Design a protein around this ligand. Structure first.
Ligand SMILES: [Zn+2]
Ligand SMILES: [Zn+2]
Lengths: 97, 14, 44, 190, 64, 64, 68, 53, 54, 304
């Protein structure tokens, strides 16, 4: 589907893994990298693009242990969801004024 | 020689 | 019906004969005319 | 009076090494700016079609334009659809029936193929008459092909200073760098 | 497959990093990357944890 | 430049160091680890300077 | 053949060609003030109205369907 | 069997070939140095006879 | 004032209404002049151009 | 320990010049990553409607069919995107289009000279009727439920004054368009925003006490609404940072080179969103943020 994990570069314990995303670009990648790196648990986080012509995004997460990189992913997206949700309420109020 | 004669931009939201 | 004169610019028709002869001009050059035909396209 | 024959366009160029897809002489066009129609030169090509090339003076040819009373293949009326010639407005693909002539030598009609590379549109089909009083059946036709040349990658653009280069890649507008005023440059040179 | 092996092992570009004319190399980055290296490796460059990790991952991509 | 145990410590990269020049860092890396590792290093440098130059572009102007 | 959409920015300028002509001719002005009153601020927009050869007038009078 | 256009230097010391192509080059740093950029038009065109194991 | 000018009004007027008198920008005429002058002097000369003399 | 609550507490908005056509709101205490993500989503991803799949019944005008089709496609409509549905694109053409997934436009203009023309007149309107073809000539002949739904929403161009083509006597044009939803990235014709850029709030760090007429000439370098003069002590000072474009004109003068560093704050984005007539800038901005939220939610929900 849209998201997949790379068993080639995964770790045995799952504390380090890399994910590939379809139909994405810097737009989602930079924001998601920021949000994930906000989490102090993860050790290494970053996004990569195979080739600009292809609409593929590759994201790699290496935690400091005790947390599955998959969990660190869904933790980031939920924070991202709230992050793009607070602005709506904050922006809506300023419209009322 | 006579020099070339002379001729006798807002931020966003302004 | 078609085949504008391109000299006097008058629509006409052919009869397998004297395609040169523009009845008003006689000019030996004739020019075809676009008709009502569907032409699909892409706006890109 | 050169203004009566203008050519080229003013482009918002940026002397910047940003994408990295241009080191020697390549250049990058803004993809949206292309989609706006940044440069849309077109090719007009005409060729002469006739059947008197083998005809001699005193021997009228058994073959002439049109087609009928035969078992000619159907679907030719897709674009080869009229008593004499194809429609002006049509999208000729490769091998499409350019023109049909009924032949009595074979007692059946034969057609002329496209025999080209790029699919094109018919721009103008005109009827040419013999200079002499050779009324006959007008076995001489000239048609014009319209070819749309949208600028793809590798198409040589240039300035007025010999800084010729090729279109490296249609860089997407969002990924294109922007300025304080919000303008996104269309032409990038290294 | 014989020609495949010849190209991949004898005619491949990596095997030809040098030139028999004088033994000097012929392959490398040219102008944009040279300027980028000059600017990046200068002492006036500093990168936070985010920038450093992002550059390293984008440059490496170990999954490949 | 002064490498030491696979670590840059002084100087900056250049055309002489990497690109097409003799006795460069990439040349020595070839000499040590074979041609394959040198080719991978050149590819990685090309990727890095491309990503880096996008972050901070390089440009020449009339002021220069 | 007035460019309908701004090439670089994207501000619609096709409608503004006739208005620019009227503002230039009927009222005595200069091009800068004419574009200002027309409502163009960035030169990415100002191009397609400051410089546009109207090759439809010269290119159009060669009509084939009307007697000369 | 002639001076410079002879059968040797035209059909024996050089020949036209199958499964070949020619085009222009667009630089692309985003590819590995030991790799080449093959458009999809070539991909459906050039084929390789490979046995089924 | 200005060193150059677009002359948009002149260009549009000329496009709409081609001149019925001497054409504008005469320099083009006296840029193709040599060929026209040669071909005219071939017949438009003091005595049968040059063809009659030849 | 950065957190959602900390971000909410620190984040604030300042709408400056909201308008039915243009917006100039500010973003404060947010990261360039999210700011640029919003910019890109607004420019590309925000859906809109524009004409494509144009069908020509007849054309003889000087302008070519391809050029005319592209020109028509590059038109801003008025219908809101949230009234139409996407097309599967893998269907037969008859099934490819319905009432609620596309709209239909017709032009069918004919031009002929009007005999009543003043002598010595060059105006095409007087010389011939239908001399020019405008956007408003485009109709929106509906189908099925569209008649009921668009009763208060007549599909009209966002700019009916644009010049599609010019005609002549004996010159006729007849076509038929099919506008669908766009995704922007597919083609710039689907761009609900003319431009959705942003600029970081300029920062001016005055070090020396700038006083006297030398302060006045320092006032001159910047735009007029930026620098202020302290009447209390004849001191130059910053009055409004947003009023300044990044000009660096002071850097040219040697006296002020050491007296000020032209910095720039890193968490103050001066958004500036123009728009076509399809939607208002506030509406498209809300669409963009909701699109980002939907992207995140879909990415979370899709398993690996
Ligand atoms: Zn006639
Ligand atoms: Zn613009």
């Amino acid at each position: 589907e849209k998201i997949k994990l790379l068993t080639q570069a995964t770790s045995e314990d799952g504390t380090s893994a890399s994910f590939q995303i379809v139909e994405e670009d810097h737009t989602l990648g930079n924001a998601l990298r920021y949000v994930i790196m906000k989490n102090p648990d993860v050790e290494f986080c970053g996004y990569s693009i195979p080739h600009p012509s292809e609409n593929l995004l590759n994201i790699r997460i290496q935690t400091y242990g005790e947390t599955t990189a998959v969990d660190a992913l869904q933790k980031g997206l939920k924070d991202l969801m709230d992050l793009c949700d607070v602005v709506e309420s904050k922006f809506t109020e300023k419209i009322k004024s | 020689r006579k020099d070339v004669p002379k001729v006798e931009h807002f931020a966003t939201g302004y | 019906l078609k085949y504008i004169c391109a000299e006097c610019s008058s629509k006409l028709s052919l009869s397998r004969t004297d395609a040169v002869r523009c009845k008003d001009c006689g000019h030996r050059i004739l020019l075809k005319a676009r008709t009502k035909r569907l032409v699909q396209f892409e706006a890109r | 009076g050169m203004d009566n024959f203008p050519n080229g366009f003013n482009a918002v160029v940026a002397v910047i090494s940003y994408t990295g897809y241009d080191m020697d002489d390549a250049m990058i066009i803004n993809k949206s700016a292309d989609e706006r129609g940044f440069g849309y030169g077109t090719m007009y090509k005409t060729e002469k079609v006739d059947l008197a090339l083998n005809r001699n003076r005193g021997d009228p040819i058994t073959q002439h334009f049109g087609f009928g009373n035969d078992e000619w293949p159907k679907e030719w009326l897709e674009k080869l659809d009229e008593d004499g010639l194809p429609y002006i407005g049509t999208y000729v693909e490769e091998g499409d029936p350019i023109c049909a002539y009924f032949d009595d030598t074979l007692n059946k009609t034969k057609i002329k193929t496209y025999h080209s590379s790029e699919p094109a549109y018919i721009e103008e089909v005109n009827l040419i008459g013999d200079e002499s009083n050779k009324f006959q059946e007008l076995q001489t036709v000239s048609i014009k092909y319209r070819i749309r040349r949208t600028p793809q990658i590798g198409d040589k653009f240039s300035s007025r200073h010999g800084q010729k280069g090729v279109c490296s890649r249609k860089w997407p507008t969002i990924d294109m760098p922007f300025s304080e005023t919000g303008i996104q440059p269309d032409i990038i040179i290294n | 497959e014989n020609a495949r092996a010849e190209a991949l092992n004898l005619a491949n570009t990596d095997s030809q990093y040098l030139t028999p004319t004088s033994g000097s190399p012929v392959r490398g980055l040219i102008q944009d990357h040279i300027s980028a290296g000059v600017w990046l490796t200068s002492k006036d460059s500093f990168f936070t944890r985010e920038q450093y990790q992002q550059y390293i991952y984008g440059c490496i991509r170990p999954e490949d | 430049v002064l490498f030491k145990d696979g670590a840059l410590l002084c100087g900056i990269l250049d055309k002489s160091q990497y690109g097409a020049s003799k006795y460069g860092i990439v040349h020595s890396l070839h000499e040590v680890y074979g041609p394959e590792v040198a080719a991978k290093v050149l590819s990685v440098l090309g990727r890095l300077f491309t990503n880096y130059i996008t972050a901070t572009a390089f440009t020449c102007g009339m002021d220069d | 053949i007035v460019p309908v959409r701004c090439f670089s920015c994207g501000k619609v300028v096709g409608d503004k060609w006739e208005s620019y002509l009227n503002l230039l001719q009927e009222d005595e002005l200069d091009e800068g003030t004419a574009l200002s009153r027309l409502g163009l601020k960035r030169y990415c927009c100002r191009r397609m109205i400051l410089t546009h050869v109207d090759l439809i007038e010269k290119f159009l009078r060669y009509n084939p369907l009307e007697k000369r | 069997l002639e001076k410079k256009e002879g059968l040797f230097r035209k059909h024996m010391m050089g020949k036209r070939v199958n499964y070949a192509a020619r085009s222009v080059i667009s630089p692309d740093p985003n590819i590995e140095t030991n790799e080449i950029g093959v458009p999809p038009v070539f991909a459906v065109k050039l084929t390789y006879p490979e046995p089924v194991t | 004032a200005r060193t150059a000018d677009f002359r948009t009004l002149e260009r549009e007027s000329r496009f709409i209404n081609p001149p019925k008198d001497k054409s504008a920008f005469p320099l083009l005429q006296e840029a193709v002049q040599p060929h026209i002058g040669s071909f005219n002097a071939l017949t438009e000369g003091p005595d049968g151009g040059l063809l009659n003399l030849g | 320990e950065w957190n959602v609550e900390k971000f909410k507490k620190d984040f604030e908005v300042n709408i400056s010049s909201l308008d039915a056509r243009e917006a100039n709101f500010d973003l404060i205490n947010i990261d360039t990553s999210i700011a640029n993500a919003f910019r890109r989503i607004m420019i590309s991803e925000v859906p809109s409607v524009a004409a494509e799949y144009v069908y020509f019944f007849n054309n003889t005008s000087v302008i070519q069919d391809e050029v005319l089709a592209h020109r028509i496609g590059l038109v801003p409509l008025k219908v809101d995107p949230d009234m139409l549905t996407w097309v599967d694109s893998n269907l037969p053409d008859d099934e490819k289009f319905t009432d609620e997934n596309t709209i239909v436009l017709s032009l069918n203009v004919k031009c002929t000279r009007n005999p009543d023309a003043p002598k010595g007149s060059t105006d095409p309107k007087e010389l011939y009727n239908n001399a020019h073809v405008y956007a408003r000539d485009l109709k929106f002949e509906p189908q099925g439920r569209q008649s009921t739904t668009f009763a208060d929403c007549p599909v009209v161009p966002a700019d009916p004054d644009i010049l599609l083509a010019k005609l002549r006597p004996g010159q006729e044009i007849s076509l038929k368009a099919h506008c669908i939803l766009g995704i922007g990235g597919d083609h710039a014709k689907f761009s609900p925003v003319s431009t959705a850029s942003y600029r970081l709030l300029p920062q001016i760090n005055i070090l020396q006490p700038i006083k006297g007429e030398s302060a006045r000439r320092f006032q001159k370098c910047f735009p007029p609404g930026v620098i202020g003069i302290d009447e209390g002590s004849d001191e130059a000072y910053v009055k409004d940072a947003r009023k300044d474009t990044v000009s660096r004109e002071v850097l040219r003068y040697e006296e002020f080179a050491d007296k000020v560093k032209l910095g720039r704050v890193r968490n103050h984005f001066i958004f500036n969103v123009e728009s076509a007539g399809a939607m208002t800038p506030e509406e498209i901005f809300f669409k963009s943020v909701r699109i980002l939220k939907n992207k995140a939610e879909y990415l979370k929900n899709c398993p690996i």
